[PDB]
Symmetry: C5
Subunit: 235 residues, 5 copies
């Protein structure tokens, strides 16, 4: 649990879709397949954290998503090849896959002391909250800017977001060089209209036009314990 | 002996558009079994008729790579999720390949207050009464320029947008969903009409205003279909 | 036959490709399947026109194309769902699909009377000729122009095409709002080298630069009676 | 034993490039049946050897998602069409997925007359004599700017294009096909070479001239292969 | 092994993904299938070099990657068609495929002599290190520039990269004319956070803005002996 907050921690987003031929299995065999998976997760639960999301019926061409924290992607690599080896995995098509390490804040030091104070707040306490993942690539312009400039952009970014700081938990991952994006943004909320308004707000700052890629995909789901998701496939 | 249905009109209501295409192996089922599969779905939908509203569209032979579409209204997307996961679980669902999927909430109008009072009067109108009309769906994403603008400016764009559309308010039903943050688009537009020739002209008119050049994504896909009750649509697959 | 020419007529372009698993079928069943299709077409030949094109060996990822005219798309939809319901249809992957109504001319009134006269010509009589289909989408600039302006463009367009009025039959469909394009252009010819020069001619006017989508796909085929095309699959 | 093809050089001659990829299930055939399948094709080619020329290239392991390519010459694409549908009918064809497909007529040179006389002389050279050489194909589409130009301008561009290429005139055979209106590109370029490193240099040189920025589409795909007799290519499928 | 450094040597990057129907094979068949492959590679180890990478769980839609060195692509070609012919190959969908020859340095001579000193270094010794592959295409602007200009860009590229020469091995392949890219870049490292920073650094120079294609795909994997990779598939 000191992974959801600490730096140097790699964070991975893996998406899967269940095959059609899965339903041509006897119902029990599916239940046994579930147990295989459930056992594997616990077997790794010492080295890594694993969270589950139901994308089925919210995200196109996706049923399930894992969010995996680990000090090294090697450990994460092993976990996923193993998961895809199970009887259940063998009927899963690997969808999206994105890595990004959590880093120490980069621009907040140049913010007003009154703005830093409010950023210690992160999000509401919630159970079965919605979850959103949005990958981002900046344009070349953005990197060419100087520190003072970007600091001012992020400061305007932060400002527009302040009224949604309680109803929206947030986490940021640094993905450059591990895949075709710069950032992976991750959000939890019970109030989706709030998240919608939060995004339309951020769409109006300067920073935004420098997003060469925004979404594609925009993953929407529900946070749920793993077994409950698997239950749906074993009936 | 009847009920409210306060959803096709009210705000705060999420609206979801789901597309499906039927597998080849579906026809490798005996006809008898397929009709039962139909009954399963009709029953599931009825089982949900209290929590959500669900309308059905036949895309087969009008929209590329799509046979069926649902329009699903709900106070929460969780309910819509549950419904769709259940639907994709049925014998019929197990033979459907999930196509497109888009969400958007219905809001109260944003720019309409700054229109002339004579224009607001005409906008109370939405469409004439028709049965089994054509239906169109167009996802839209605006460019960054558009958001950089101020309220007064966008209001003029929308006022010009509205002006061009006025001649088509009766022959074309319309509804708008605010989709930003739930997927890769800003808006979902939905239209019903008996006169497609009119809907065609309605669009080429809008192509000529200012606003249009700010549509970073327009369609892709542009889903065209026919509104029909679910069983009649399903009946076609049980033969 | 007043469908190939009149206005208010919807025109539909449907493309298909045959599955591999089709040849793993006994020959008997395939010939029977052909007969099934031939009959369906006959039933609709009263309400609609349906023409057949062999794209196999000329257009990538396509074997067959239908051109369907109708007073209403509802009728066309019915025919197409039915064709894809047939034993043979069930072994087809639905390729492209484009609609467009035929309209009354928009810019021709503002042409010189000598130019209107030469446009009375449409094309030479040819049997089992090549056929080409090109979808078109205009940029926003094109729509921003005024009538006088666009009329001059089409007039420059018309001019370059005149030497090809006999060797190239032509028809135009208005597709905006029924799919992701503004126009569907359709041509028949025995002389492909002429059609090539015709397009290289038109590539040099102004109008052309306003075509944000040109082709994609560019469908090339041969016009043929339906049965002769199906015969190849019945062996 | 006494005849001229007169197709690899003459104008008015259509040229077609067809790419195929083999199904997995092809190997689920007994080796014997697969060798039989080969002969079916070799015979078909001879049966057509009167009407068309057909050259074969092995793309498997050099060009992504493509195993086999044919280069087909014909006075009419109709003849090519028939040949290809017949080929896709063979036992082997039935297990081939149609990949890329591009047509283009060979024409008389357009800009070369306005070149210096010393440059026309060196262009009579085309390439060195080689057996089983590498082969490259690059489809190309020009931008609208390019067509807007006048003849004098374009002629000046091609002269710099030509100038840059001269040092590679010997190690690289070349042929150009005019494809506009038959598919989604303007030209199909074709090259043979024993020396790929030269061909690499040939291209990086041309990347630096005037003409180049007007190539709206360059490659996509860029097909690389080996020129080989048909049977040798086919033997590999029967193991 | 005199190939990993020398010029005139072709270098090829081939990526594969395993079908589902592979697991519908009995283990006995799969062990036999692996054995064929291990044997095939040994059969070629005399003419060419072949290194193996595990992409499973790190790169989307990819399980395995080969890095193949050869004096001629024909030899590389022969090897790959054979590999794809094997019982195991029959169940692989060919993912990416990229070739590029290694050349002698082009811009480095015009660098400071103190910089040349630092470039003799390439990387630290590691076993089973991460590996990243990044394809690159330059824009037309880049080629239009003169030697003096491009030389200054690469010197700026080089300067920013100097701090990472020890923790990051590098090799560059010249790909123009063999596929749809100008370069193939290849990196080994045990330290991924460093590689991430290396890339964010280069994102801030000028050269970067001329990369019309950067990644797509960005292949991330683990270096492992082949048998160890195939073992996972034989269970
Ligand atoms: C309550 C909501 C949010 C708050 C308070 C917030 C605030 C911040 C702050 C303070 C930073 C500075 C991080 C640093 O200094 O390294 C940041 C970075 C960033 N945010 Fe947000 N943010 C919010 C939501 C979002 C959303 C909704 C998105 C995208 C849809 C987003 C995209 C980004 C990106 C891409 C960066 C990194 C830019 C860079 O370091 O170059 N953020 N945000
Ligand atoms: C008879 C037909 C139509 C009428 C009367 C109409 C009228 C309006 C009005 C009054 C608004 C402002 C509502 C608000 O305050 O949010 C609006 C918004 C909008 N309309 Fe339409 N419209 C019509 C057709 C269309 C069509 C055919 C399209 C696209 C194909 C379209 C796209 C949009 C979009 C994207 C917005 C919201 C833009 C924004 O809020 O930034 N409309 N329309
Ligand atoms: C002999 C060959 C051709 C002739 C005589 C011809 C002539 C014309 C004329 C007179 C119009 C104006 C229609 C009107 O005013 O209502 C028109 C429209 C159009 N043509 Fe052609 N054309 C030819 C070939 C082509 C080709 C080969 C293409 C595309 C590859 C093409 C694309 C278009 C498009 C997109 C329009 C609609 C523009 C608009 O209404 O805004 N035409 N053509
Ligand atoms: C030894 C190598 C080459 C030589 C000597 C050469 C020379 C020429 C010459 C003299 C022409 C004018 C032909 C005409 O009158 O249409 C031409 C046309 C053309 N070349 Fe090359 N070229 C070479 C390589 C290439 C390469 C490597 C490419 C592309 C990868 C290429 C692309 C083209 C195109 C697209 C045209 C037609 C342009 C037009 O007609 O508008 N050429 N070449
Ligand atoms: C420690 C890390 C690195 C060092 C010391 C380095 C150094 C160099 C040097 C000296 C050259 C010029 C060689 C020549 O004259 O051809 C070069 C070329 C190049 N480098 Fe790097 N580089 C490093 C990392 C990277 C990375 C991380 C990337 C891409 C993500 C990259 C992309 C390229 C490309 C595309 C070229 C081709 C330039 C050309 O020859 O036109 N390099 N590098």
């Amino acid at each position: 649990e000191k992974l959801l907050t600490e730096s140097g921690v790699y964070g991975t987003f893996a998406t899967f879709q269940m095959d059609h031929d899965w339903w041509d299995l006897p119902g029990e065999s599916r239940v046994i397949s579930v147990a295989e998976v459930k056992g594997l997760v616990e077997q790794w639960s010492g080295k890594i954290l694993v969270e589950s999301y139901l994308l089925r019926g919210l995200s196109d061409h996706a049923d399930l998503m894992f969010r995996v924290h680990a000090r090294t992607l090697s450990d994460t690599q092993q976990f996923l090849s193993a998961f895809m080896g199970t009887r259940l995995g063998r009927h899963l098509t690997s969808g999206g896959l994105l890595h990004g390490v959590s880093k120490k804040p980069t621009y907040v030091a140049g913010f007003p002391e009154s703005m830093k104070t409010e950023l210690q707040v992160n999000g509401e306490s919630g159970s079965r909250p919605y979850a959103i993942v949005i990958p981002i690539k900046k344009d070349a312009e953005f990197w060419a800017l100087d520190q003072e400039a970007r600091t001012a952009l992020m400061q305007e970014h932060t400002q527009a977001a302040l009224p949604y700081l309680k109803t929206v938990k947030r986490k940021l991952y640094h993905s450059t060089g591990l895949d075709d994006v710069d950032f992976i943004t991750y959000f939890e909320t019970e109030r989706l209209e709030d998240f919608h308004n939060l995004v339309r707000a951020l769409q109006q700052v300067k920073e935004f036009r420098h997003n060469r890629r925004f979404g594609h995909p925009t993953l929407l789901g529900t946070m749920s314990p793993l077994d409950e998701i698997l239950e749906k496939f074993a009936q």
